[PDB]
Design an enzyme around this catalytic site. Structure first.
Site, PDB file in Angstrom:
ATOM      1  N   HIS B 169     -36.883  19.527 -41.931  1.00 35.22           N
ATOM      2  CA  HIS B 169     -36.710  18.447 -40.983  1.00 35.22           C
ATOM      3  C   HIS B 169     -35.665  17.363 -41.320  1.00 35.22           C
ATOM      4  O   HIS B 169     -35.873  16.163 -41.084  1.00 35.22           O
ATOM      5  CB  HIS B 169     -38.082  17.822 -40.713  1.00 35.22           C
ATOM      6  CG  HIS B 169     -38.238  17.217 -39.335  1.00 35.22           C
ATOM      7  ND1 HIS B 169     -37.624  16.020 -38.990  1.00 35.22           N
ATOM      8  CD2 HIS B 169     -38.942  17.654 -38.257  1.00 35.22           C
ATOM      9  CE1 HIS B 169     -37.957  15.763 -37.745  1.00 35.22           C
ATOM     10  NE2 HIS B 169     -38.755  16.722 -37.272  1.00 35.22           N
ATOM     11  N   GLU B 303     -33.676  22.020 -36.591  1.00 38.32           N
ATOM     12  CA  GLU B 303     -34.855  22.693 -37.168  1.00 38.32           C
ATOM     13  C   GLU B 303     -34.798  24.195 -36.897  1.00 38.32           C
ATOM     14  O   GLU B 303     -35.082  24.643 -35.807  1.00 38.32           O
ATOM     15  CB  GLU B 303     -36.119  22.050 -36.593  1.00 38.32           C
ATOM     16  CG  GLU B 303     -36.065  20.501 -36.724  1.00 38.32           C
ATOM     17  CD  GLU B 303     -37.199  19.793 -36.049  1.00 38.32           C
ATOM     18  OE1 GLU B 303     -38.367  20.137 -36.129  1.00 38.32           O
ATOM     19  OE2 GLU B 303     -36.797  18.771 -35.338  1.00 38.32           O
TER      20      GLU B 303
HETATM   21  O1  LIG Z   1     -40.851  12.915 -35.516  1.00 37.42           O
HETATM   22  C1  LIG Z   1     -40.960  14.327 -35.701  1.00 37.42           C
HETATM   23  C2  LIG Z   1     -40.292  15.066 -34.557  1.00 37.42           C
HETATM   24  O2  LIG Z   1     -40.405  16.460 -34.908  1.00 37.42           O
HETATM   25  C3  LIG Z   1     -39.722  17.312 -33.968  1.00 37.42           C
HETATM   26  O3  LIG Z   1     -38.332  16.981 -33.951  1.00 37.42           O
HETATM   27  C4  LIG Z   1     -40.362  17.104 -32.588  1.00 37.42           C
HETATM   28  O4  LIG Z   1     -39.888  17.990 -31.566  1.00 37.42           O
HETATM   29  C5  LIG Z   1     -40.192  15.672 -32.101  1.00 37.42           C
HETATM   30  O5  LIG Z   1     -40.837  15.542 -30.804  1.00 37.42           O
HETATM   31  C6  LIG Z   1     -40.844  14.743 -33.140  1.00 37.42           C
HETATM   32  O6  LIG Z   1     -42.274  14.791 -33.124  1.00 37.42           O
END
Ligand SMILES: OC[C@H]1O[C@H](O)[C@H](O)[C@@H](O)[C@H]1O
Ligand SMILES: OC[C@H]1O[C@H](O)[C@H](O)[C@@H](O)[C@H]1O
Ligand code: NA
Lengths: 346, 339
Positions: B169, B303
C-alpha cells in the site's frame, strides 16, 4: 541504567541495572525474561539470542497464553457454547496452541520511575486466533526495582466472552549452570494439596489430593532431591515434578514459595490460586544453555495461575473472562541474600 | 550501505543506500516501506516514527492482507462453505479486518548481496485469525538494488484451504510534499477495462466496463488532472479514483504503469492481473506528513493484486489458496531519472 540493543530477528534486548548493581534483561519476543544476574552469576536459564529460543525451546522465560497449561481435547465452554481450540499436543491444546503469544514480537514502552523501571509489552490477540473468541487487547508489565523485586503485572480486555489465564515461564537454577541439577536447592511451599495427572498425556486425573507428610510436602523447607528420589507414582509418571500445587492461603501479601541455594533465595508472591511446578524432566535431551548441556532436573519453574484442569475440576476455579471486564494478575519474584542458613552437600 | 535504528514501540527502521546514493527505508511494523528519497526529496508518503502510523493512518506503505480490498459482508466461500471474516468497515471486511497484519511487528533478516540487498520479513497468521482458516506462514521480501529497482516478493503456505491476496500500500507523490496534489503528474496505464463501484460503500457493482476513450483511459500518457476534473459518475462518486483496473497483458516483463513528474519517473511491473488505484480522496482530513497537512489527492497508490470483488464477479479471478500450495507474487517499482 537502561540499555537497549537488537537481540536478533528484529527483537530487542532491554537490560536494566538497579542501584544494588543487580541486572535483569527482557526481550519483546514473547514478552520474556532473558536473564537475571547477581555478581556475574545467572539466577535463571536463558539463551544469548532470539534465534536460539526459536530453534531450541521457545518457552523459557516467556509469557504464555492465552491459557497456560493443557486443556483436554482443546475443549472449553464459553457462555454456554463449546469451543474447540488449536490442538498442538496430540488432541490437547497446550499453552494456547501452536505459534502462540510466546512466539510473537510484542510492541513496548519503557517507563523510568527512578527506583523502579517498568517495561510494558502489548499485543492484540485477534478474534478467533487459535480458536479463541476475541479480540483481546493484552499487556504485560515487567518491572524491576531498587529492592530487587521483579514484578509481572498482567492486564487484558476482550470484545467477546472468552477464556484467559496466562503465566510466566521462567526457569530458575541457582547453580548458574544448566548442567547442574537443582536437586541441591532447598524448597519451601505453602501448599497442602496437589492435582495428579491422569497419565503420560499429562491431562488432569480428576481428583485433588492431600500431600501432607509425603515426599511432595514442602511446607517445611527440604532439599529437592527428596522429591526427585521419590518413587511415588506421580513422581515416577513424569520423572520429577510437573504439577499444579494448590496454595493454602491466598493473597499477594504472603510468601508462597522460597527457593534457596547457599546464601541466595528467591521468594514468590502472587495473587493467583496455584503454582505449577515443572522441574525440567528432559532426560538426556541436553539443550545447550550458554554452551552447557542441560541436565535432567536442570531447572525449575513457578508458574502462578489458576490451576489447569478447571474444565474437569470445577473446584479449581473459573477462567472465563466476560466481554468488557478487565482481567488483572500480579506475580512477584524477589531476590534476597542470607535470608536463612542453607549449607548442604550433595 | 545498510543502517538499522529503533523506529519506536520496539519497531526497527532498516535503511538502504545503493551505489547511486538513493535511499529507501523499511520498518518491520507491518513489513512496510517508510521512505524513498533521491537528492533529499521524498518520492512517497511516510511518517517519522512508529507511533504516527498507529495514531494517524496505519495503511501507508504497508503489506495489507491476507486479502487486500473490500469483501462484501465479510463473506467468502471456501470448499463450498461460507466463512464470515472480521468486519471492520460496516459489514465489509476491508484489508483483512481490524488489527490486521499491517499492525503487527514482523520478524526479519537482512541479506546483503552487494549490488542488491534483501530484507525478508516473516509472520505467521494463526488458524482462525480474524476468521481466516490457517496457519498461514507468510514472507514478504523487500529488495533494493543498484539499478534503482525496488522489488516485493510474496510467499505463503497454509495448513488449510483458505484465501490469500495481499498487496503493498505505498502512496507516491513526486512533489515530495503532501500539501500538494498529484494532479500535475502524468500517468500511463496499460489497462482498457475497469471495475465500477456500487455506491459509497465502495463494494463492487457487478460489471466490468470498457474505459476506452473515456476520462479513465490512460493507455496513452495523460495528466491526472484530466481524470480529476472528469464528470463520469464513477469519478464523481468517489471524488477521484478508487478502482481496480484490469491489465491488458499479463506478465512481469511488461511495464504496466508509469507515473511521471518532470525528469522523474516510476515504472510498475507485476505478475498480478489488476492494479487498484486510489488517489487519496481524503477531503479536508488534512493528515500530517512531515509536518505538512495532506491535501485531497495528495497521493496515489498502485495496489497490484487480483481485483477485489471476485466474490461477485468470478471472471476476475480466484483468490483461493489450497492447503499445501505455495503462493507466490512479485511486484516492482523501478525509479528512473532522465538525462
Ligand atoms: O485508506 C486505505 C485505502 O485503501 C484502498 O486504497 C481503498 O480502496 C481505499 O478506499 C482506502 O480505504
Ligand atoms: O516445556 C513446556 C513445559 O511447560 C509446563 O511446565 C508443562 O506443565 C510441562 O509439561 C512442559 O510442557
Ligand atoms: Na529494535
Amino acid at each position: 541504567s537502561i540499555k537497549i540493543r537488537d537481540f536478533g530477528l528484529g527483537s530487542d534486548l532491554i537490560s536494566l541495572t538497579n542501584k544494588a548493581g543487580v541486572t535483569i534483561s527482557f526481550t519483546n519476543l514473547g514478552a520474556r525474561i532473558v536473564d537475571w544476574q547477581k555478581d556475574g552469576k545467572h539466577l535463571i536459564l536463558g539463551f544469548d539470542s532470539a534465534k536460539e529460543y526459536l530453534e531450541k525451546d521457545a518457552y523459557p522465560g516467556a509469557t504464555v497464553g492465552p491459557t497456560a497449561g493443557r486443556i483436554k481435547d482443546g475443549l472449553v465452554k464459553i457462555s454456554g457454547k463449546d469451543y474447540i481450540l488449536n490442538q498442538n499436543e496430540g488432541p490437547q491444546t497446550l499453552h494456547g496452541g501452536e505459534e502462540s503469544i510466546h512466539t510473537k514480537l510484542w510492541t513496548y514502552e519503557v517507563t523510568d520511575l527512578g527506583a523502579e523501571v517498568q517495561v510494558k509489552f502489548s499485543l492484540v490477540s485477534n478474534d478467533g486466533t487459535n480458536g479463541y473468541p476475541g479480540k483481546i487487547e493484552m499487556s504485560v508489565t515487567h518491572s524491576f526495582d531498587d529492592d530487587n523485586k521483579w514484578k509481572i503485572h498482567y492486564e487484558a480486555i476482550s470484545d467477546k466472552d472468552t477464556v484467559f489465564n496466562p503465566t510466566g515461564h521462567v526457569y530458575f537454577n541457582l547453580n548458574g549452570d544448566a548442567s547442574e541439577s537443582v536437586e541441591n536447592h532447598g524448597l519451601r511451599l505453602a501448599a497442602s494439596r496437589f492435582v495428579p495427572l491422569k497419565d503420560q498425556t499429562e491431562i488432569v486425573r480428576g481428583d485433588i489430593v492431600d500431600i501432607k507428610n509425603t515426599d511432595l510436602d514442602f511446607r517445611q523447607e527440604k532439599q529437592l532431591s527428596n522429591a526427585f528420589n521419590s518413587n511415588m507414582e506421580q513422581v515416577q509418571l513424569v520423572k520429577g515434578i510437573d504439577h499444579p500445587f494448590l496454595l493454602d492461603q491466598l493473597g499477594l501479601d504472603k510468601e508462597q514459595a522460597r527457593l534457596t541455594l547457599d546464601d541466595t533465595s528467591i521468594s514468590v508472591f502472587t495473587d493467583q490460586p496455584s503454582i505449577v511446578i515443572f522441574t525440567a524432566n528432559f532426560g538426556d535431551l541436553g539443550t545447550l544453555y550458554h554452551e552447557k548441556k542441560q541436565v535432567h532436573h536442570g531447572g525449575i519453574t513457578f508458574e502462578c495461575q489458576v490451576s489447569p484442569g478447571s474444565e474437569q475440576i470445577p473446584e479449581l476455579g473459573d477462567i472465563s473472562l466476560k466481554a468488557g471486564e478487565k482481567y488483572q494478575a500480579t506475580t512477584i519474584y524477589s531476590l534476597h541474600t542470607k535470608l536463612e542458613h542453607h549449607h548442604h552437600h550433595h
